[PDB]
Amino acid sequence: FHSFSFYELKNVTNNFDERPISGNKMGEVVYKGYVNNTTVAVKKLTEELKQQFDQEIKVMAKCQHENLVELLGFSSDLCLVYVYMPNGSLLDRLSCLDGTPPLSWHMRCKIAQGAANGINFLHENHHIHRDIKSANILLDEAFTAKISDFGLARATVMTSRIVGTTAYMAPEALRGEITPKSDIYSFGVVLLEIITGLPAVDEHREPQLLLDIKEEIEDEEKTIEDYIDKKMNDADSTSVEAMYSVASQCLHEKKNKRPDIKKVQQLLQEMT
Numbered sequence: 001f002h003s004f005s006f007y008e009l010k011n012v013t014n015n016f017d018e019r020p021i022s023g024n025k026m027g028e029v030v031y032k033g034y035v036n037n038t039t040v041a042v043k044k045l046t047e048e049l050k051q052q053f054d055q056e057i058k059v060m061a062k063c064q065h066e067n068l069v070e071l072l073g074f075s076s077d078l079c080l081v082y083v084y085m086p087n088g089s090l091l092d093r094l095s096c097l098d099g100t101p102p103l104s105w106h107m108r109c110k111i112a113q114g115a116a117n118g119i120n121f122l123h124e125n126h127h128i129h130r131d132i133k134s135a136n137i138l139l140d141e142a143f144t145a146k147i148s149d150f151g152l153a154r155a156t157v158m159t160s161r162i163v164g165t166t167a168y169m170a171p172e173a174l175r176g177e178i179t180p181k182s183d184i185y186s187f188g189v190v191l192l193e194i195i196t197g198l199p200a201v202d203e204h205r206e207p208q209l210l211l212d213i214k215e216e217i218e219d220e221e222k223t224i225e226d227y228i229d230k231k232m233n234d235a236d237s238t239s240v241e242a243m244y245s246v247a248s249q250c251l252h253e254k255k256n257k258r259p260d261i262k263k264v265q266q267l268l269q270e271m272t
C-alpha cells in the first residue's frame with residue numbers, strides 16, 4: 001500500500017469537495033479522486049473511526065482477491081484510497097438509482113457467483129465479514145462483484161458489542177455470536193434482493209423485512225414468481241427458482257443447518 005500525504009489527496013479530490021458530483025462527494029465521507037490519470041475512491045475518516053481504519057488496512061493486507069475491493073493506499077486527517085468502481089453498489093443498481101438501466105438476470109447471476117467467490121476467499125482465509133449486504137457489494141467496469149467495507153471483519157465465540165445491519169443479520173449474530181455461518185444468512189438476504197429488486201427493509205411495506213417473504217412463500221400464501229423483479233426481460237423460471245433455493249437454504253434459522261460458502265458457490269455454479 002502507498003502512503004499518501006494529506007496534500008496529495010486534498011489536491012486530487014478538488015480540496016475534498018463535499019457537494020455531490022452532479023463537486024467530488026459520491027456518498028457517505030467518500031470522494032472521487034484522480035491520481036496519475038486513474039480515478040480513485042477516497043474515504044475521509046463516536047471515536048471508533050480511528051479503530052475502523054486499523055482493521056480495514058489489516059484485513060486488506062492479508063485479503064487480495066478479484067471479488068474483493070483493492071485498497072490502493074492510506075493517509076495520516078485520516079484517509080483510505082481504493083480502486084474506483086464505476087458502477088457503484090449492487091443496492092444502487094438494483095434500485096436503478098440516478099436513471100441507470102435495470103440489471104439483467106444474466107448479469108445478476110454473475111454478481112451472485114462473484115460475491116460468493118469473494119466470501120469463499122474470506123472464509124478460506126478464516127475471516128468473517130460481519131456486514132454482508134448489497135451496499136457492500138460494489139461493481140467495476142465489467143459489473144464484477146467486489147466485497148467492500150472490512151472495518152467490522154474478524155479473524156464458537158461471543159461478543160458484548162453486537163455489530164452489522166439488522167435487516168441482514170442472522171438470529172445468532174443479533175445474540176452476540178461471531179461465526180462465518182452468520183455471513184451465509186446475510187448473503188441469503190442479498191440473493192433475495194437480486195431476485196426481487198426490493199430493499200432488505202422498507203417501513204412502508206408488508207412485510208417490512210425482505211427475509212420474511214421466505215415464510216410467505218413456504219406457507220404457500222405467495223409464490224417466488226409473484227416476487228420476481230419485473231424490471232427484467234431474461235429471467236427464466238428454472239434459474240430464478242434455483243437461486244431462491246440457495247437463498248432459502250442460506251436463510252435457515254439454525255446455523256448448522258445452513259450450507260457453507262463452498263456449497264453456496266457450488267449451487268450457484270450449477271444454476272448456470
Ligand SMILES: c1nc(N[C@H]2CC[C@H](N3CCOCC3)CC2)c2c(C3CCOCC3)c[nH]c2n1
Nearest residue numbers: 026027030041043082083084085088089148149
Ligand atoms: C466506487 N465507489 C465506492 N463506494 C461508493 C460509496 C458511495 C455509494 N453511494 C450510495 C448512495 O448512492 C450514491 C452512491 C456507492 C458506493 C468505492 C469504495 C468504497 C469506499 C468506502 O469504503 C468501502 C469501499 C471503494 N472503491 C469504490 N469505488
